[PDB]
């Protein structure tokens, strides 16, 4: 990565940390923040390093490759190239392949990221990767929010835990999530807690609901 | 974080440390100082990083989200925005969403924290988070201070350990805690130790009590 600006190699325990995360948590939602946390200020070379070091899960890595290709082609479409020799006091504009680091050298990425004004190629590639990881996490969710129903002997806290776990997995827009929380959460509770939640009212906070069905 | 001022990424073993703390201790009181200790000088991006990397416990994380939203709306209420173009030698004032890092870039947070005079957005967001964690820890306490009573075969030291454990969990004000220590601690001891503590007097220190019922 490049930290405040000096450039360092990706540390061993960052690599081992990312490999261990992929091995342990597979494609749980929290894998995506951890990824983002293990790659702050990272160049495209570091991002490709993290992705290439993943063993197995080659179907998801192939889907991620396809997503990266789509985002690259879209970038090249929105940024047409202009012919002409590069001036001695300037540097070329990156293509879609240069953002991914496939056709760009390390010092070209450094020169892009440290220039005034800056061209944040690492963060662009990073948000492309995070898009692909979003598609993977959403696809690999085994459950649907419609099937999360509270058991007759189940405490309210565990039911809410399952509900917001699946909800985080589905990655719907905040309005749709608002509707699922406002309707399904109270709707799919067990009879007693459901009655109490109905008595609480439409605009109750989650804290009031949990302490009410406690 | 930003240490003396240079900016660094959140280290891998800080992440792994926080994840291990959440996995092991769940929402024990000491989780909150550890959190504060793992996030000194942290930007909002680092705080959101720590929160997002929590797997499971999504009910508590949702309550924490609600608390953060409330504190943000209150901040925006106490700080009304003024229209006008930002001067070349100044920078905009953050909203409630900028403190949480949802609508603020990393370099905007850095520019807020390193400016003269400083705007400590990381510590504001941090104290909001700590508020929410306080509500979570208080709610998840299984015991009440009224139910901590010394057994007939129980040594005094273990009884005091349980008592101040629950007391730390309840998070009442220092005056109420003073009353609970002054009344309940001696009140709920076993007959013999209770008599000895009565004979000690009203203004005895905890050391004198423990060495008296030793």
């Amino acid at each position: 990565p490049i930290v405040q600006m000096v450039h360092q190699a990706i540390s061993p325990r960052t690599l081992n940390a990312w490999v261990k995360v992929v091995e342990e948590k597979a494609f749980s939602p929290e894998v995506i923040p951890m990824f983002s946390a293990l790659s702050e200020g990272a160049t495209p070379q570091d991002l490709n390093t993290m992705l290439n070091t993943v063993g197995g899960h080659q179907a998801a890595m192939q889907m991620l490759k396809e997503t990266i290709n789509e985002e690259a082609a879209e970038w090249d479409r929105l940024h047409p190239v202009h012919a002409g020799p590069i001036a001695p006091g300037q540097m070329r504009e990156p293509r879609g392949s240069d953002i991914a680091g496939t056709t760009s050298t390390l010092q070209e990425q450094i020169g892009w990221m440290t220039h005034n004004p800056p061209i944040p190629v690492g963060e662009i590639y990073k948000r492309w990767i995070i898009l692909g990881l979003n598609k993977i996490v959403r696809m690999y969710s085994p459950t649907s929010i419609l099937d999360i129903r509270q058991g007759p002997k189940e405490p309210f806290r565990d039911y809410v835990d399952r509900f917001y776990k699946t909800l985080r997995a589905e990655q719907a827009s905040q309005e749709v999530k608002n509707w699922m929380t406002e309707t399904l959460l109270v709707q799919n509770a067990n009879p007693d807690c459901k009655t109490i939640l109905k008595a609480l009212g439409p605009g109750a906070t989650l804290e009031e609901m949990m302490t009410a069905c406690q | 974080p930003i240490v003396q001022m240079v900016h660094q990424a959140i280290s891998p073993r800080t992440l792994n440390a926080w994840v291990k703390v959440v996995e092991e201790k769940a929402f024990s009181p000491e989780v909150i100082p550890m959190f504060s200790a793992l996030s000194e000088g942290a930007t909002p991006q680092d705080l959101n990083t720590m929160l997002n990397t929590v797997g499971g416990h999504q009910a508590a994380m949702q309550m924490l989200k609600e608390t953060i939203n409330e504190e943000a709306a209150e901040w925006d209420r106490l700080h009304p925005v003024h229209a006008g173009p930002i001067a070349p030698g100044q920078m905009r004032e953050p909203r409630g969403s900028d403190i949480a890092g949802t609508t603020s870039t990393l370099q905007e947070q850095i520019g807020w924290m390193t400016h003269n005079p400083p705007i400590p957005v990381g510590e504001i967001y941090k104290r909001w988070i700590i508020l929410g964690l306080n509500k979570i820890v208080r709610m998840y306490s299984p015991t009440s201070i009224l139910d901590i009573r010394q057994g007939p075969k129980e040594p005094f030291r273990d009884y005091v350990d349980r008592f101040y454990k629950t007391l730390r969990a309840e998070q009442a004000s220092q005056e109420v805690k003073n009353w609970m220590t002054e009344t309940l601690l001696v009140q709920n001891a076993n007959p013999d130790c209770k008599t000895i503590l009565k004979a000690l007097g009203p203004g005895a220190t905890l050391e004198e009590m423990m060495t008296a019922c030793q």
Partner: peptide, 9 residues
């Protein structure tokens, strides 16, 4: 398209 898993980020 998916909105992401960053609840607080």
């Amino acid at each position: 398209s998916p909105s992401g898993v960053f609840t607080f980020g």
